[PDB]
Amino acid sequence: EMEILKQKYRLKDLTFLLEKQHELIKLIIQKMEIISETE
Amino acid sequence: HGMTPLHLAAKNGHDKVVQLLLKKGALFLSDHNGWTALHHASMGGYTQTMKVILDTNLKCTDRLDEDGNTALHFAAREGHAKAVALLLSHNADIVLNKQQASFLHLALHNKRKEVVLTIIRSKRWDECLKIFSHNSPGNKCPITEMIEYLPECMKVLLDFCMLHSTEDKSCRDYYIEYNFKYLQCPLEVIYEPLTALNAMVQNNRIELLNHPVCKEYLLMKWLAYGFRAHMMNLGSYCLGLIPMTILVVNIKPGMAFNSTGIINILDTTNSYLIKTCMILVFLSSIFGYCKEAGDISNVLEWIIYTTGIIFVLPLFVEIPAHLQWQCGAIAVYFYWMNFLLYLQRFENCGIFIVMLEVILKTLLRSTVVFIFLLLAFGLSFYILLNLQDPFSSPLLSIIQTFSMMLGDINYRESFLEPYLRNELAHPVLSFAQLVSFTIFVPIVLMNLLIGLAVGDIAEVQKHASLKRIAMQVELHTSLEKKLPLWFLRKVDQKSTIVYPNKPSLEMEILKQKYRLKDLTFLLEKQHELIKLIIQKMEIISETE
Amino acid sequence: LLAFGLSFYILLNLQDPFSSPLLSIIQTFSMMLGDINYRESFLEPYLRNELAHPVLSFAQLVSFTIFVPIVLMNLLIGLA
Amino acid sequence: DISNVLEWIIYTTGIIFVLPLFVEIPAHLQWQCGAIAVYFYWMNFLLYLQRFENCGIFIVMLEVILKTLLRSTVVFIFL
């Protein structure tokens, strides 16, 4: 039970960090500027 | 796909651009498959976009796509509990899907615990419970769905139905009340007696079945009709079981008797008791025959009734005492053997009867090997020890072998005394056969039986409480189906006040698997976004 | 025990151990542990023509031996 | 194999038991061989029952228990 709970906490931390990373990448796409491929 | 740029903005959850579009003369249209901006916001679970888009017209809340699903259906299916709460608070409309799958049903089928909890805590929980399909092959009543899929949500709902009040010290001030609204199917085919309990027992909801609400529901049904029916059945059986026992105990076996009294000089001392007992036995046997007119139990009851008729037959026509008392012995033996099965419908004795049945079944399975071993050893002992009374006949030889299987080998009297007196025809052969028999039957066969029994008992004890509650539920369901209309409404309570003072691996693994699946999906989306970043970024310095 | 004791009391009424209902149940309780007095109680009366119901008594003996000392004791040992 | 030895004993004792068909023999040896033959005949029928879906597992259990007993027989005989 202790090992399974530790794995679950590791996965929860991975999930939280992935949400933060996804938000940061969305910000990168939102704020970056494009001057060559403007279609 | 007719996707408006507003649809794209809602799909990717960009509040500011949605506000900019809506402010500068945007219009609410429908893309291919009938979706809209609210549908995409529900799919993405962007609550801010919902709250910004909902207060502009108040007309896109209830829109049907090409399949009939609304924003609430997508929000509940994707697992966005907060978006579901925001939609429900803003006068969301519940409409059955073209498939007849409501948003609560979609949440239950996808096993979203927090969405279901938020739905239950919503002020419109009863309304959302009301609308469901009464005839669709799937998408059954919500209570059954949560019993099957999410036992924890149902446990929380029952604790909400616990109604634990007067929590002011343990000073005999408790008036805790039990409510039974959610244990009865809310639709109103046929009327199933106990839908919730049957659903719980079918899905092995032992943790849910052990809840105080369910236990008290079963207890209330017991005191309502189950105890009455149980007492009626036991009295009907005892009316013939008991007088037979008095007849056997108060009359010396092998002696003829009739209504007047003992006829084998006439006693005329217990004449009234004897006449009453035989009258009761005859009436009970006739009642049993009539109930048969209108399985091992059937054969047992038929033998009991026939032997009861023959035993008390001298009421009208005299019969020899020999046949009378043979039938009396058979009748009393099978009467108590059948009372054993009558005890099965109890919460304290049923599991022992189940264990007895499984052990008996295993013994009957092994009886072929048993009788072959007994035949071998009995014929051997019959040839070897033919000059002894126990082994003087083949049938007596097999019966004696059966008797000594249990370890009661008469080693001294059967082997040693004849040997020292020079009575054994084949001494070495007889002693070798004795050693072989002792090694084989009483050691190996009995050890095999004890191991099989220890496995059977362990297997039965694996599902003890579930089996007990299953038998109780089945008995109550049969009783409800027996009493058609009036007794149910007479005894149905929906509420009872109780005075206490008297004045886990499969679920965890599945949760981990869902977490990993969500991580995988988010990683695909993140990888796509990074690929887009590489595709669209511009490079002016390192052009090689 | 009540079933088997009453059966043995009717079937073997002419024997001292089963001469009374209470003694019959006590004797059945005693022979539960596998101490069935097969010879003295069944075989010797049978060869001397003392059993009132020989076939019934032998069938009941086989049923008792199958039921109590085997099945009941095995059930108790598994529960323990 | 145990089956081959069982069958050989069965056949030899069967020949000796019904030998008076041609040559007379003392009844003592005849009936000793008859007892041996019938005992081993039913013991071998036990193995013949093994090729069934209802009795095979009991024969397997008997075999494993017998093997364990033969393993422990050294300590048994010393005690």
Closest CA to B307 of B273, B341, B335, B276: B335
The Cβ-side half-sphere exposure at B164, using a 13 Å CA radius, reads 11
Q: Token pair for residue B140?
A: 């059954």
Give the Cα separation of C34 and B406 in Å (integer).
6
> D39 and B376 in contact (C-beta within 8 Å)?
yes
Give the Cα separation of B310 and B247 in Å (integer).
14
Angle subtended by helix axes B37-44 and B71-78, to nearest 10: 10
Give the Cα separation of B76 and B50 in Å (integer).
14
- Residues of B with CB below 8 A from C14's CB? 254
- Residues of B with CB below 8 A from A35's CB? 538
Q: Give residues with Cβ within 8 angstroms of B246, minimum separation 6.
A: B273, B277
Residues facing B495 on adjacent strands: B179
> B341 and B300 in contact (C-beta within 8 Å)?
yes
Residue with tokens 């079918």: B202
Q: What is the 8-class DSSP label of residue D23? A: S
| C28 CA: distance to closest CA in chain B (Å) | 13
Which H helix or E strand runs over B178?
Answer: strand B177-179
Nearest residue on chain B to A36, alpha-carbon basis: B538
The Cβ-side half-sphere exposure at B257, using a 13 Å CA radius, reads 26
Compute chain D's Rg from CA coordinates. Answer: 17
Give the Cα separation of B152 and B33 in Å (integer).
36
> Are A8 and B511 an interchain contact pair (Cβ–Cβ within 8 Å)?
yes
Q: How many CB atoms lie within 10 A of CB B432?
A: 13
Chain D residues whose C-beta sits inside 8 Å of any chain B C-beta:
28, 31-32, 34-36, 38-39, 41-43, 45-46, 49, 54-55, 58-59, 61-62, 65-66, 69
Give the Cα separation of B379 and B367 in Å (integer).
18
Using CB atoms, list chains with 3+ pairs below 8 Å to chain A.
B
Q: What is the 8-class DSSP label of residue B24? A: T
Q: Token pair for residue B95?
A: 């409409």
Best of B327, B333, B349, B362 to mutate (most C CBs within 10 Å, chain C): B333
Q: What is the 8-class DSSP label of residue D57? A: H
Is B161 annotated to bind a ligand? Reply is yes
- Residues of C with CB below 8 A from B390's CB? 39, 43
Q: Token pair for residue B198?
A: 């049957």
Q: Give residues with Cβ within 8 angstroms of C57, minimum separation 6.
A: C11, C12, C42, C46, C51
Backbone angles phi, psi at B259, to 5 degrees: -65, -40
Give the Cα separation of B445 and B430 in Å (integer).
21
> B292 and B302 in contact (C-beta within 8 Å)?
yes
> B14 and B49 in contact (C-beta within 8 Å)?
yes
Give the Cα separation of D10 and D34 in Å (integer).
9
Q: Token pair for residue B364?
A: 């009957």
Backbone angles phi, psi at C15, to 5 degrees: -115, 145
> Are A4 and B523 an interchain contact pair (Cβ–Cβ within 8 Å)?
no
Question: What is chain B's percent helix, strand, coil content, to nearest 5?
Answer: 65, 0, 35
Give the Cα separation of A28 and A22 in Å (integer).
10
The Cβ-side half-sphere exposure at B529, using a 13 Å CA radius, reads 18
Which pairs count as long-range contacts for B272-277, CB under 8 Å and 24+ apart, including other chains? B273/B246, B274/B247, B274/B250, B276/B243, B277/B243, B277/B244, B277/B246, B277/B247
Give the Cα separation of B428 and B426 in Å (integer).
6
The Cβ-side half-sphere exposure at B543, using a 13 Å CA radius, reads 5
Q: Give residues with Cβ within 8 angstroms of B312, minimum separation 6.
A: B247, B278, B281, B282, B285
Is B513 annotated to bind a ligand? Reply is yes
Backbone angles phi, psi at B168, to 5 degrees: -125, 85
What is the identity of the amino acid at C50?
Answer: E
The number of helices, as runs of H, and strands, as runs of E, in chain C is 6, 0
| C34 CA: distance to closest CA in chain B (Å) | 6
Angle at B10 between CA B518 and CA B53, to 5 degrees: 125
Closest CA to B328 of B281, B370, B291: B281
> Are B379 and D42 an interchain contact pair (Cβ–Cβ within 8 Å)?
yes
Using CB atoms, list chains with 3+ pairs below 8 Å to chain C.
B
> Are D36 and B369 an interchain contact pair (Cβ–Cβ within 8 Å)?
no
The number of helices, as runs of H, and strands, as runs of E, in chain B is 27, 2
Going by the annotation, the residues of the binding site of A are 6-12
Give the Cα separation of B63 and B59 in Å (integer).
8
A4, A12, A25 ranked by CB distance to B529: nearest: A25
Instruction: Specify the resolution in Å.
Output: 3.1
* Technique used to solve these coordinates: cryo-EM
B127, B135, B136, B201, B333 from B189: Cα distances, Å: 23, 8, 12, 22, 46
- Residues of B with CB below 8 A from A24's CB? none
**Torsion of the alpha carbons at B192, B196, B198 and B200, rounded to the nearest 10:** 170
Q: How many CB atoms lie within 10 A of CB C54?
A: 14
| Residues making up chain D, counted from first to last | 79
How many interchain CB pairs under 8 A, A with B?
49
> Are D65 and B366 an interchain contact pair (Cβ–Cβ within 8 Å)?
no
Give the Cα separation of C78 and B450 in Å (integer).
8
Is B413 annotated to bind a ligand? Reply is no
Residue with tokens 């809840």: B211
Q: How far apart are the first and last CA of chain A?
A: 56
Give the Cα separation of B432 and B211 in Å (integer).
63
Is B290 annotated to bind a ligand? Reply is no
Q: Give residues with Cβ within 8 angstroms of B530, minimum separation 6.
A: A25
Is B59 annotated to bind a ligand? Reply is no
| C54 CA: distance to closest CA in chain B (Å) | 11
Q: Coil, strand, or helix at residue B177?
A: strand
Q: Give residues with Cβ within 8 angstroms of C40, minimum separation 6.
A: none
Give the Cα separation of B92 and B77 in Å (integer).
16
Q: How far apart are the first and last CA of chain D?
A: 30
Give the Cα separation of B452 and B470 in Å (integer).
25
Q: How many CB atoms lie within 10 A of CB B213?
A: 21
Angle at B22 between CA B19 and CA B23, to 5 degrees: 80
Which H helix or E strand runs over B121?
Answer: helix B113-121
